[PDB]
Paper text:
One group of metal ion efflux transporters that regulates metal ion homeostasis and can be found in all domains of life is the Cation Diffusion Facilitator (CDF) protein family. MamM was recently proposed to function as a magnetosome-directed iron transporter required for iron biomineralization since its deletion abolished magnetite biomineralization and mutation of residues within the conserved TMD metal-binding site resulted in alterations of magnetite crystal size, morphology and even mineral phase.
Although no cation binding was detected for the resulting double mutant, D249A + H264A, by ITC in vitro it still produced magnetite particles in vivo. However, magnetite formation was severely affected in the D249A+H264A mutant as a significant non-additive decrease of the magnetic response, the average particle numbers and the average crystal sizes were observed. In addition the D249A+H264A double mutant showed a drastically delayed formation of magnetite during iron induction experiments. These results suggest that proper sensory and regulatory activity of the CTD can be achieved through a single type of binding site, either the central or the two peripheral sites, to allow proper activation and transport of MamM TMD. Therefore, the reduced magnetite formation reflects decreased MamM activities caused by less (e.g. MamM D249A) and/or shorter (e.g. MamM D249A+H264A) TMD activation events. To confirm that these observed phenotypic differences are due to true transport function alternations, we also examined the expression levels of all MamM mutants, their ability to stabilize MamB expression, performed MD simulations for dimer stability evaluation and determined their CTD structures. (ii) All mutants exhibited an apo-MamM CTD-like behavior along the MD simulations, and (iii) an absence of structural differences was observed.
Numbering used by the authors:
A (entry chain A), B (entry chain A): 211 to 293
Amino acid sequence: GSHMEAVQNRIVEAAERVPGVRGVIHLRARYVGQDIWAAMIIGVDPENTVEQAAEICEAVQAAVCGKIRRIESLHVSAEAREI
Amino acid sequence: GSHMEAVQNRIVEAAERVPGVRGVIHLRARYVGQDIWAAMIIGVDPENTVEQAAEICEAVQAAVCGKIRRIESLHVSAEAREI
């Protein structure tokens, strides 16, 4: 913690910058040693296709893991969300 | 178990009969006392909208809980799936 809060901040921020993300609805992050393992849910446009939602999830996973190096496991899922 | 396997059978079967379900991809079911609590993932058409996928999930939840009375908690989520 404290230092976790700073990491979580960077995860939320990294995710929100990815096209199609309507907020991070949920983020659970934990230290396994010096590595982070995490799970998040993002908001998506309810009219996107399931495919697009899966694409946005992958894109988040890559942007986030691309920016926070200590992350060794991130699962990203999606939920319909209004703006 | 044994009797769990019979319940799980009925959950899979109930789910597959619901329009838009492309198989049950995952089912975790457990006894809390004499009640079942469960979580499942269904296949959906990747071109459905996220909204439709959420609708199909609710419809599964209701059909299944409507048919297996001992179920007191069922969460249903969806994943893109090819036929």
